[PDB]
C-alpha cells in the first residue's frame, strides 16, 4: 500500500479536513538579498497597466508622471488601471444615498479627531524612512530627527504639540528656500536645495517582504517617509470611521466579527430567496490590487466625502492623495556582482543604475533597467500611477463596498441582484436570479462595473458555485464556518519576550484557540505539555529533580533543594507544572500563591529587585523578577552613528528626572508647551510653598530650595 493522505478527501469533505493542506509547519520563504529586482518590476508593471494613459512632466519634482484616469476604456480582460472618474463618483453618490448621512457623521468624528490629536501619535508606528539620514529608523527616532531639523531651520509651529501644527510646519518647509541638516560622518552641514528636499520628502523606501506564506515569488513592500505619515493617518481615520458604519465592510473589525457579518449576509441572501430563485456565491479575488488604485481616485473620493465641510478640514484631508500622486519609489539596496575568474565580489548602490553600463546584468535585469531608466531621477523612480503597498486599505475597501452596494436591485433595474462582503483585496459576492442566464448576466455586470471603477477580478483564482460552500480570506464556510487550526499553529511556540510573559502568552493562546478555533480538550492538554517542554528547553528551567546539565542547572537544583514546598516553585525556577484545561485563564504566579514558601514568595515578587522593567496580544501578566528584558544587538558601535547612544543616555537621564518630578508622566503622556526646566522649577517652587504653608518644610529648607531654584533659573537664562 502506498499511503496517500490526499485520498482522505474522498470521505472527509474538503472544508472539514482543510487544515491538512496548510504547510504552516516549515520555515516560510525568506528574501535572500536585495529588493531592487522586485521594485523595478513593480514600477514597470504599474506603468504597463496604464501605458495608454496621458503622460506629463511634474513641474516641481521635475520627473515624468502618468495620468491614466479617464483613459480609454479597456478592450481586453487584461488588468487595466483606467479608472473612470464619473463612475467612481456615481458609486460614491449611490453609496451615500443608500446610507444617508454616513459622510457627514464620518466628517464630524474625523474633525474632532484631527483637532484633538497630538504629535506623539506618529511615534506609534513601524519602521519609517527618515529623510535626514536616507536610512530606515524607528518611528520615534525619525520624528525626533525631523522635529530637530525643523526647529533648526526656522520651522517652530509644531511646538504647540498638536499634530496639525506639525503638518503646517511640514507644508511650510517645502516652500523654504534651502533646508540644511547636520548629519554626522565632528559633523558636517549638508544643504539641500528646494527640489532636492522636495524629492526627498516625497520619496518612498522599498524593502523586500519577508516571511510570506502562500506565494512562490517574493514581493516588495514600501514604507513612507515622515512628512506623509500624518496626512495618511488622518485619511485612514476618516476611512475607518466610514467603514465602521458599513454593514458590508469587513476590514475595520476582527476575525469573529467578520464571521458574524459573513454569516448574516449569507443567511439574508440564500434564505430570503424563494424556491424558484437560484443563488451563487463567488469566492473571487482581485488581481494586482495595489497596481491599479490610482491616488487621483482617492482624491476624488476624499473630495466627494468632504462636501459641505470647513475648507481647512477638506485641505488637510486632501493633502495625502496629492502627495501620494507624486511619490518617488526609492529603488533599494542595489544589485551585487561577482567575478568567478578573479574570485571577488562587489556591491553597487542602486543609485548608479541610471549611469552604469548594461554589460554586467542578465538578459532580464538588463531589460528591466532599460525600461525603468527613463523614470529615474536622482536615484529614485517616479511611481505616480499606482500604490506600492496598502497604506489606504480602508479607503480601497470603501470603494469595494460601494461597488458591492451598486447592485441592490434598486440600481440593477433587473431581476438579478447581488451583494456580499468586501475586505481589501478579497470579496465574496452572492448572486441571485430566476434562471442561470440571469446569474451569467449578473456576473458580467459586476465584472464590467468593477473594471470601470479600476479594480480587476482575478479570473484564475475565482470560481462560482451554488450558495453554501464558499471561502473568504481563509475562513472556509460549509453550511456554517469550519475552524481551520493550521493558521494559528505558528503562535504556539514560546513567543520570546521573557519568562513570565512567555508563560502567560502561551497559556492564553491555548485558551483562545480552545474558544475560537475549536481545539479539543485532549489536543489542548497535549499542546500544553508540548509548550511546557519547549519552554523548559528554551529557558533552561528544567524541573530540578532531573540531572540535566546546563549553564543554569546548578542553582536551579540548589534552589529546589533549599525550598520546603517544592510544589510551589514557578515553572521558570524548576517547579512542577500545575496547569490543566481548567486553569488556563489564571496567571501562573497567582495560581501557586497558596503553595509558595514565605521566603521564596518574598524574594520572588520584590519591587526592590533590579530586573523588573516597570512594564512595557493581551497577555495577562503579573510583575515578578522573571519580567526582565533582553539585551540589544549593539551592532551600531562599529558604524559612524556611535554618537546616537550618548543621545539616548542623556535623553533617558532627563526623562527619568522628569518622571521623578511629575509622578503622572509615566502613566499619562505629559502635555504642555513649557520647556522642561521651567516646568521642573515651577513644580519645585509650588511644592516647597505648599509644604511650608502646611507640612514638613521649614524656613531654612524653603530658603535653600528657593535660592537653588533661583540659581537654576539664572543658569537657564544664560
Amino acid at each position: 500500500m502506498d499511503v496517500n493522505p490526499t485520498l482522505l478527501f474522498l470521505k472527509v469533505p474538503a472544508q472539514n479536513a482543510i487544515s491538512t493542506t496548510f504547510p504552516y509547519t516549515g520555515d516560510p520563504p525568506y528574501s535572500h538579498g536585495t529588493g531592487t529586482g522586485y521594485t523595478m518590476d513593480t514600477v514597470n508593471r504599474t506603468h504597463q497597466y496604464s501605458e495608454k494613459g496621458r503622460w506629463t512632466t511634474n513641474t516641481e519634482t521635475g520627473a515624468p508622471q502618468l495620468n491614466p484616469i479617464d483613459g480609454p476604456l479597456p478592450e481586453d480582460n487584461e488588468p487595466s488601471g483606467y479608472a473612470q472618474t464619473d463612475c467612481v463618483l456615481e458609486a460614491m453618490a449611490f453609496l451615500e444615498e443608500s446610507h444617508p448621512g454616513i459622510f457627514e457623521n464620518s466628517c464630524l468624528e474625523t474633525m474632532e479627531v484631527v483637532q484633538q490629536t497630538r504629535v506623539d501619535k506618529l511615534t506609534q508606528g513601524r519602521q519609517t524612512y527618515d529623510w535626514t539620514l536616507n536610512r530606515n529608523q524607528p518611528a520615534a527616532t525619525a520624528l525626533a530627527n525631523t522635529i530637530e531639523v525643523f526647529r533648526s531651520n526656522g520651522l517652530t509651529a509644531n511646538e504647540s504639540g498638536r499634530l496639525i501644527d506639525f503638518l503646517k510646519d511640514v507644508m511650510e518647509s517645502m516652500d523654504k528656500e534651502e533646508m540644511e541638516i547636520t548629519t554626522h560622518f565632528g559633523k558636517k552641514k549638508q544643504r539641500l536645495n528646494k527640489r532636492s528636499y522636495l524629492i526627498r520628502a516625497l520619496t518612498l523606501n522599498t524593502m523586500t517582504k519577508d516571511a510570506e506564506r502562500g506565494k512562490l515569488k517574493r514581493r516588495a513592500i514600501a514604507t513612507p517617509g515622515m512628512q506623509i505619515r500624518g496626512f495618511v493617518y488622518f485619511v485612514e481615520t476618516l476611512a475607518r470611521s466610514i467603514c465602521e458604519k458599513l454593514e458590508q465592510s469587513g476590514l475595520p473589525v476582527g476575525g469573529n466579527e467578520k464571521k458574524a457579518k459573513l454569516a448574516n449576509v449569507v443567511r439574508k441572501m440564500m434564505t430570503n430567496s424563494q424556491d424558484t430563485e437560484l443563488s451563487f456565491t463567488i469566492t473571487g479575488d482581485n488581481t494586482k490590487w495595489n497596481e491599479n488604485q490610482n491616488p487621483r481616485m482617492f482624491l476624488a473620493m476624499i473630495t466627494y466625502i468632504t462636501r459641505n465641510q470647513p475648507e481647512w478640514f477638506r485641505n488637510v484631508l486632501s493633502i495625502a492623495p496629492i502627495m501620494f500622486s507624486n511619490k518617488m519609489a526609492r529603488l533599494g539596496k542595489g544589485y551585487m556582482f561577482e567575478s568567478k575568474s578573479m574570485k571577488l565580489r562587489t556591491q553597487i548602490p542602486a543609485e548608479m543604475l541610471a549611469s552604469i553600463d548594461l554589460k554586467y546584468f542578465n538578459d532580464s535585469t538588463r531589460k528591466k533597467i532599460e525600461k525603468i531608466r527613463p523614470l529615474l531621477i536622482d536615484g529614485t523612480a517616479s511611481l505616480s500611477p499606482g500604490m506600492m503597498m496598502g497604506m489606504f486599505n480602508m479607503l480601497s475597501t470603501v470603494l469595494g463596498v460601494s461597488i458591492l452596494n451598486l447592485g441592490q436591485k434598486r440600481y440593477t433595474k433587473t431581476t438579478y441582484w447581488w451583494d456580499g462582503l468586501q475586505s481589501s483585496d478579497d470579496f465574496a459576492l452572492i448572486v441571485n436570479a430566476p434562471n442561470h442566464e440571469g446569474i451569467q448576466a449578473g456576473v458580467d455586470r459586476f465584472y464590467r462595473t468593477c473594471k470601470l471603477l479600476g479594480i480587476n477580478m482575478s479570473k484564475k483564482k475565482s470560481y462560482i458555485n451554488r450558495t453554501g460552500t464558499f471561502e473568504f480570506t481563509s475562513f472556509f464556510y460549509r453550511y456554517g464556518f469550519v475552524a481551520n487550526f493550521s493558521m494559528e499553529l505558528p503562535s504556539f511556540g514560546v513567543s520570546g519576550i521573557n519568562e513570565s510573559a512567555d508563560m502567560s502568552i502561551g497559556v492564553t493562546v491555548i485558551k483562545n484557540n480552545m474558544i475560537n478555533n475549536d481545539l479539543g480538550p485532549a489536543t489542548a492538554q497535549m499542546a500544553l505539555q508540548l509548550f511546557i517542554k519547549d519552554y523548559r528547553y528554551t529557558y533552561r528551567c528544567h524541573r530540578g529533580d532531573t540531572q540535566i546539565q546546563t549553564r543554569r542547572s546548578f542553582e536551579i537544583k540548589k534552589l529546589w533543594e533549599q525550598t520546603r514546598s517544592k510544589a510551589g516553585l514557578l515553572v521558570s525556577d524548576g517547579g512542577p507544572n500545575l496547569y490543566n484545561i481548567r486553569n488556563l485563564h489564571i496567571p501562573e504566579v497567582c495560581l501557586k500563591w497558596e503553595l509558595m514558601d514565605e521566603d521564596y514568595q518574598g524574594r520572588l515578587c520584590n519591587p526592590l529587585n533590579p530586573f523588573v522593567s516597570h512594564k512595557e496580544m493581551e497577555y495577562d501578566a503579573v510583575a515578578t523578577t522573571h519580567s526582565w528584558i533582553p539585551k540589544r544587538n549593539r551592532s551600531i558601535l562599529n558604524t559612524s552613528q556611535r554618537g546616537i547612544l550618548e543621545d539616548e543616555q542623556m535623553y533617558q537621564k532627563c526623562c527619568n528626572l522628569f518622571e521623578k518630578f511629575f509622578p503622572s508622566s509615566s502613566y499619562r503622556r505629559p502635555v504642555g508647551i513649557s520647556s522642561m526646566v521651567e516646568a521642573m522649577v515651577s513644580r519645585a517652587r509650588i511644592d516647597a510653598r505648599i509644604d511650608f504653608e502646611s507640612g514638613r518644610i521649614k524656613k531654612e529648607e524653603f530658603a535653600e530650595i528657593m535660592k537653588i531654584c533661583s540659581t537654576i533659573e539664572e543658569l537657564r537664562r544664560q
Binding site: 509651529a157 504647540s160 498638536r162 501644527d165 508647551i673
Partner: protein, 52 residues
Amino acid sequence: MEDFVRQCFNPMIVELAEKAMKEYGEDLKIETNKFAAICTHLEVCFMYSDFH
C-alpha cells in the same frame, strides 16, 4: 502693528504672551489684536500681583 506690542511692553511679558499664543495655536501675524490683548491682560495681572 507688531512694533507697538513689541515696544510698549516689557520683553518678558511679550515673550510669555508669545508662548501662550503658540500654545493656543494662533499666529500673531494675523491676529495681532489678540496678541496685544493677551499682553495687556498679562501686564495687568502682573502689576496686580507684584509689590505684595
